[model samples]
Target: SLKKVVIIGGGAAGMSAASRVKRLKPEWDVKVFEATEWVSEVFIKKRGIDLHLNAEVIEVDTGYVRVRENGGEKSYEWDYLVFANGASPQVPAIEGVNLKGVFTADLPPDALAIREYMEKYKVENVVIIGGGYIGIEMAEAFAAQGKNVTMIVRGERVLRRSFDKEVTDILEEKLKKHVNLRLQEITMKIEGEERVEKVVTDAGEYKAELVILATGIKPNIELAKQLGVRIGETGAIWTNEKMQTSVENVYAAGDVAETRHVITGRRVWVPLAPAGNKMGYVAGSNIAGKELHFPGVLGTAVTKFMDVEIGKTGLTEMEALKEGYDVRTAFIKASTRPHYYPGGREIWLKGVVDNETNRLLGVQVVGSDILPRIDTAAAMLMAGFTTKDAFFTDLAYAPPFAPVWDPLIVLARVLKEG
Candidate 1:
């Protein structure tokens, strides 16, 4: 009763699935084929120590993958294949984007490229194009290194896609304290002579020794398509709740696979480590003839900007409006701990509620090291808890951890009053 399970792409999703299968059915044969040794793996003598190695995945066929390793071609077969190949950097086509100093944060090599250039030129000024997670994180990192950081955002503000203007204003204010935030500026070209010296944007021009592209990422679904599997919106390999693709005995997870939103009932592209891990567990469990249901995603994301941590769960104010919900919003600006206690940092919490049903549509929070608020919000959203439920979750409160009236409860109280 041993199942021959083979997993492709030894990244987070692949490894997670393999580990689950091995755990549940020790008798099953679980083999993982990682084309590049530089993948994020934990096996002894198999970890990718180098961060900037040029490791790429070429193409894949049904039950087999055609990979070019070190400038060569190789192929392999699998019984129950799981495609967790992950995603690639979305490098926009612009004049001079191929210049020496033009790089992206998709791979580790790009990180090194920027770091090395900074060290080599003693870079004082850096212009980063795109305002997604990568651009924001790099801005914080570079500023920490005492570099004059400038972020050129094509969108209106950082994380505008997931938040409203009110919430984005807070992010903008926090980032401006560290880096020069430029909004609605599209980089038409990265023109320079030998190295990066100038960036031409829609608004104006700025000097730069390095440029990073963090616009967004597209799913790495080429191999799955070549294997004749069903590709959904944005050309991502579509999978069911159990992570099984259109092809029999073949599964997909991670950034390469597309998921569905339980609430919207629409096929969505949510490429994150947590979603991938859950999909892998369900896939491995069913492959081993066990019962499991993924139950889809609720759209949760969290990140940090300098001394600030930002988190959002479920839909934003804009998304709620689009969903045709009579929505009401609640805002609570307070400290993570007791205000009079030794040191307390300010935390802002915003909760979106359904006016008709009083259900919690979404929650966004920002603070320094205020991870507990985000974690609690994520849990509540997952369970479809309403605003009133958040106010009375019995969340732990301490002088050092949180204030007597937690921020989440404060938002719930505000919504109740509204």
Candidate 2:
């Protein structure tokens, strides 16, 4: 049977799905609609796939999509639909946001614009809103560029939701040494003339030549909603392990879709790049009549500053407790390399486990060479390993790589001993 596939959004997920579908089912008609003007025309033409640029999807039906382009409207019929519309940065409804110098650092265009603004205005003092992953990274970048950076966080500490205090405390200490970090502060309004001059927070006022909003992101689900696709508990499009949406012959992926958490068995909107790409592949394979499944996500992520590296995965202590699990946490600070080695940096590792089940809940690590420990814990959690299993998991060790007893193993042993 002949089939027509329409994929919305030309992001990583959409492009991945397009590549898969075109490679597997050459006879099937595959079309990708992107709102942006910079569509991969050459790639699509070479792959014999139809690519539409500057096409805004205004509505979606069971088997049709209404798009507006070139000041006109057109409709396309589709047998299978893939919603990979990605996400956008969440901008707060505050005054002075329309100011010329106040901008966000979510998209590639936004980054370019911010760079241009920095050069044009000779930005000296930078104020970043939100202390999430992006905000922390931007703060580090600005500080490295010799700008006086200040971060205003509404919570008591940075990454309060993603990590426990034991992990964030070390990160906070390292971050404070580089930039001006203000915690428990809320932004009331942005104050400036024609451009951003300062920010008024509930705590106080901050002068800033450039204001960057790294707040957060929300899924783009307007078209999906039009098609009556159910929203998941995590506020993203509900999809099964096969990446199929509630509507028949309709699939969603990337930041717009929600998948289950491996440990909690609850729907979570992780929105990581790797997971999004995998989900896109799974969705495209099923569309191509191939049986493939995406097993869900662990929410694993890693980031670094000048000398500090941070990594996290799965549920935090607070999250486990809230989920009604009897949580036990173990924090250990150990050497990344042997004490007799030429150079060694201290690594802080925190592990969370369920007291009743003894299963590994989460792990957060901070220090030089931190990713190895975090990755080991992630692998253990993925295999449903308990604290005892992790302690005896036989991780390789060398003088330059890790200490005789890896920090992660030490953490697991601590939890086991408790």
Candidate 3:
């Protein structure tokens, strides 16, 4: 029997799902309703999947979706529905946020537009709001382009969600040398006549030719809510391990969907691109009558601020405590290579574990050659490895890449003993 697979949103998750479904069941009709632009889905359309760009899904009925496209409304019926409508940039009410010089760090075009504005307006000072990953990264980007950047954070430190003070300390020092860093400062207003000229904060004010709101994002879940899809405790659309929603044959993925956490076995929403693609694959596989599970997420992430590279996977110490675990932690300062090696770059790693079970809960690292360490830690969490189990695991070692005791092993060894 041929299936009609209709996916909302043409972003990472939706396209991945549609592609997998069409490839596995070529006879099935796979269609995508992409609101606004269709930047990420040219190949899928060429492969014969019906794709409608500038199509807004306003309503989701029992077996059909009502969409507004090309100035008209139409209903498209589906045997299966995958909601990957993604998320929108979170913008709060600031005095001059709607001004010409203010922009959200959401769209690809926004970056290009910022570049154009900078060149046209001779932008020297850039004010970026928030102190999370996007805010930190954007500060670095602007600095690289010869702009004096002032990054403001309402929180005490940067990356408050994923890491504790020790990890943020190293990165903050590096970022401070690169940008005008402001902590515990709330962006009260973006004050500009028509173009962004100044950013007023609770503490003080700063002049700016460009202001970027890297504030955050919220999932686009109106259609899901209208269809009576169960929202998770995490506030994203709830989905089972197979990516199916509360409604039968209806699935959800990307930022709009929440999945189980690997360690706590609790529902979580991690809106990263890697998980979005895998979730889509799982959703498509199950829709094609093949059994596959989205084996949860660690919320694994890695980013850089200037020259300092940072990586984190699983829970932070505070998160572990909140989850009701007896949290034990260790911070290790080591070199990327052996002391005897010439090109050794200093690396700092923090390991979090359950005191009772000795199970590895999380790993945070900041320095050179980051991806391998964080990825291995993610593997350890997935395999449910205790500190001892992780310490004994044979990892590749060499003078060029690692010390005799790899940083990850050092972290595990410390957690295993302490």
Highest-scoring model, lDDT: 3
lDDT of 2 by residue, 320-394 (tens): 888999888888888878898978988888888999989999998998888788788888999999999998988
Compared with the true structure, what per-residue lDDT tens digits does model 1 show for residues 220-260?
A: 77767778889987578888888999999899888888888
Clashing pairs in 1: none
Which model scores highest in TM-score? 3
**Preferred candidate (lDDT higher): 1 or 3:** 3
lDDT of 3 by residue, 329-387 (tens): 99999998999889899999998999998899999999888988999999989999999
Instruction: Name the lDDT of candidate 1.
Output: 0.78
Candidate 1 Cα errors over 4 Å, as ranges: 1-3, 41-59, 70-72
lDDT of 2 at 291: 95
lDDT agreement with native, every candidate: 0.78, 0.88, 0.88
The Cα error of candidate 1 at residue 28, in Å, is: 4.0
Clash pairs, candidate 3, are: none
TM-score of each: 0.91, 0.96, 0.97
How many pairs collide in each candidate, listed in order? 0, 0, 0
- Alpha carbon lDDT at 283, candidate 1: 83
